[PDB]
PDB file of all heavy atoms in Angstrom:
ATOM      1  N   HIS B   1     152.676 -50.475  70.016  1.00  0.00           N
ATOM      2  CA  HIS B   1     152.525 -49.052  69.731  1.00  0.00           C
ATOM      3  C   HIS B   1     151.943 -48.804  68.346  1.00  0.00           C
ATOM      4  O   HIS B   1     151.216 -47.821  68.151  1.00  0.00           O
ATOM      5  CB  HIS B   1     153.874 -48.346  69.877  1.00  0.00           C
ATOM      6  CG  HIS B   1     154.950 -48.911  69.002  1.00  0.00           C
ATOM      7  ND1 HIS B   1     155.116 -48.533  67.687  1.00  0.00           N
ATOM      8  CD2 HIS B   1     155.916 -49.825  69.257  1.00  0.00           C
ATOM      9  CE1 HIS B   1     156.137 -49.191  67.169  1.00  0.00           C
ATOM     10  NE2 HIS B   1     156.640 -49.982  68.100  1.00  0.00           N
ATOM     11  N   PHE B  27     143.709 -28.850  82.161  1.00  0.00           N
ATOM     12  CA  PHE B  27     143.914 -28.583  80.746  1.00  0.00           C
ATOM     13  C   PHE B  27     144.207 -29.881  80.005  1.00  0.00           C
ATOM     14  O   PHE B  27     144.625 -30.880  80.597  1.00  0.00           O
ATOM     15  CB  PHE B  27     145.053 -27.572  80.515  1.00  0.00           C
ATOM     16  CG  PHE B  27     146.397 -28.019  81.036  1.00  0.00           C
ATOM     17  CD1 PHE B  27     147.197 -28.876  80.295  1.00  0.00           C
ATOM     18  CD2 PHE B  27     146.872 -27.559  82.253  1.00  0.00           C
ATOM     19  CE1 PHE B  27     148.432 -29.279  80.764  1.00  0.00           C
ATOM     20  CE2 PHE B  27     148.111 -27.958  82.725  1.00  0.00           C
ATOM     21  CZ  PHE B  27     148.889 -28.819  81.980  1.00  0.00           C
ATOM     22  N   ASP B  62     155.309 -25.499  75.383  1.00  0.00           N
ATOM     23  CA  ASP B  62     154.709 -24.781  76.502  1.00  0.00           C
ATOM     24  C   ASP B  62     155.181 -25.283  77.860  1.00  0.00           C
ATOM     25  O   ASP B  62     155.400 -24.475  78.767  1.00  0.00           O
ATOM     26  CB  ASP B  62     153.181 -24.869  76.431  1.00  0.00           C
ATOM     27  CG  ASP B  62     152.591 -23.950  75.378  1.00  0.00           C
ATOM     28  OD1 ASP B  62     153.240 -22.938  75.039  1.00  0.00           O
ATOM     29  OD2 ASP B  62     151.477 -24.239  74.893  1.00  0.00           O
ATOM     30  N   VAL B 128     206.817 -81.828 125.537  1.00  0.00           N
ATOM     31  CA  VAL B 128     206.655 -82.223 126.931  1.00  0.00           C
ATOM     32  C   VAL B 128     206.902 -83.719 127.092  1.00  0.00           C
ATOM     33  O   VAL B 128     207.458 -84.162 128.104  1.00  0.00           O
ATOM     34  CB  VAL B 128     205.262 -81.816 127.441  1.00  0.00           C
ATOM     35  CG1 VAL B 128     204.988 -82.432 128.795  1.00  0.00           C
ATOM     36  CG2 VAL B 128     205.163 -80.307 127.540  1.00  0.00           C
ATOM     37  N   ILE B 150     202.964 -92.838 124.214  1.00  0.00           N
ATOM     38  CA  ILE B 150     203.332 -94.246 124.143  1.00  0.00           C
ATOM     39  C   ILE B 150     204.322 -94.526 125.274  1.00  0.00           C
ATOM     40  O   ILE B 150     205.202 -93.719 125.550  1.00  0.00           O
ATOM     41  CB  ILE B 150     203.907 -94.610 122.753  1.00  0.00           C
ATOM     42  CG1 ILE B 150     202.791 -95.106 121.826  1.00  0.00           C
ATOM     43  CG2 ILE B 150     205.003 -95.661 122.875  1.00  0.00           C
ATOM     44  CD1 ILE B 150     201.684 -94.086 121.572  1.00  0.00           C
ATOM     45  N   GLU B 196     184.502 -43.912 100.227  1.00  0.00           N
ATOM     46  CA  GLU B 196     185.874 -43.703 100.675  1.00  0.00           C
ATOM     47  C   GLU B 196     186.650 -45.013 100.731  1.00  0.00           C
ATOM     48  O   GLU B 196     187.874 -45.012 100.566  1.00  0.00           O
ATOM     49  CB  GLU B 196     185.893 -43.006 102.038  1.00  0.00           C
ATOM     50  CG  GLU B 196     185.290 -43.810 103.181  1.00  0.00           C
ATOM     51  CD  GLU B 196     183.796 -43.592 103.328  1.00  0.00           C
ATOM     52  OE1 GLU B 196     183.170 -43.069 102.383  1.00  0.00           O
ATOM     53  OE2 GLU B 196     183.249 -43.941 104.396  1.00  0.00           O
ATOM     54  N   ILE B 204     190.305 -53.057  92.314  1.00  0.00           N
ATOM     55  CA  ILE B 204     189.084 -52.895  91.535  1.00  0.00           C
ATOM     56  C   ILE B 204     189.048 -51.471  90.998  1.00  0.00           C
ATOM     57  O   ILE B 204     188.991 -50.508  91.772  1.00  0.00           O
ATOM     58  CB  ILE B 204     187.840 -53.203  92.382  1.00  0.00           C
ATOM     59  CG1 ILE B 204     187.840 -54.675  92.805  1.00  0.00           C
ATOM     60  CG2 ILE B 204     186.572 -52.852  91.622  1.00  0.00           C
ATOM     61  CD1 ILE B 204     186.706 -55.046  93.730  1.00  0.00           C
ATOM     62  N   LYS B 281     173.102 -51.075  93.985  1.00  0.00           N
ATOM     63  CA  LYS B 281     173.545 -49.808  94.549  1.00  0.00           C
ATOM     64  C   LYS B 281     174.096 -50.024  95.952  1.00  0.00           C
ATOM     65  O   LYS B 281     173.463 -50.675  96.787  1.00  0.00           O
ATOM     66  CB  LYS B 281     172.385 -48.815  94.579  1.00  0.00           C
ATOM     67  CG  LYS B 281     172.682 -47.520  95.318  1.00  0.00           C
ATOM     68  CD  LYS B 281     171.471 -46.600  95.306  1.00  0.00           C
ATOM     69  CE  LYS B 281     171.716 -45.348  96.128  1.00  0.00           C
ATOM     70  NZ  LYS B 281     171.953 -45.664  97.564  1.00  0.00           N
ATOM     71  N   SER B 313     153.346 -34.665  96.211  1.00  0.00           N
ATOM     72  CA  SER B 313     154.299 -35.320  97.101  1.00  0.00           C
ATOM     73  C   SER B 313     153.709 -35.534  98.490  1.00  0.00           C
ATOM     74  O   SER B 313     153.983 -36.552  99.135  1.00  0.00           O
ATOM     75  CB  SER B 313     155.585 -34.500  97.186  1.00  0.00           C
ATOM     76  OG  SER B 313     156.546 -35.145  98.004  1.00  0.00           O
ATOM     77  N   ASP B 319     155.953 -40.936  95.666  1.00  0.00           N
ATOM     78  CA  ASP B 319     156.576 -42.173  96.127  1.00  0.00           C
ATOM     79  C   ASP B 319     155.802 -43.397  95.655  1.00  0.00           C
ATOM     80  O   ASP B 319     156.399 -44.452  95.411  1.00  0.00           O
ATOM     81  CB  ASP B 319     156.694 -42.174  97.652  1.00  0.00           C
ATOM     82  CG  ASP B 319     157.749 -41.209  98.155  1.00  0.00           C
ATOM     83  OD1 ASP B 319     158.648 -40.844  97.369  1.00  0.00           O
ATOM     84  OD2 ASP B 319     157.682 -40.820  99.339  1.00  0.00           O
ATOM     85  N   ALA B 334     166.681 -61.461  90.958  1.00  0.00           N
ATOM     86  CA  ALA B 334     167.622 -61.690  92.047  1.00  0.00           C
ATOM     87  C   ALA B 334     166.935 -61.784  93.401  1.00  0.00           C
ATOM     88  O   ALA B 334     167.482 -62.410  94.316  1.00  0.00           O
ATOM     89  CB  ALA B 334     168.677 -60.582  92.083  1.00  0.00           C
TER      90      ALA B 334
END
Side-chain angles (χ1 to χ4, degrees):
Chain B
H1 57 84
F27 60 82
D62 284 335
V128 170
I150 268 60
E196 64 272 16
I204 296 176
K281 172 180 176 298
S313 182
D319 288 339

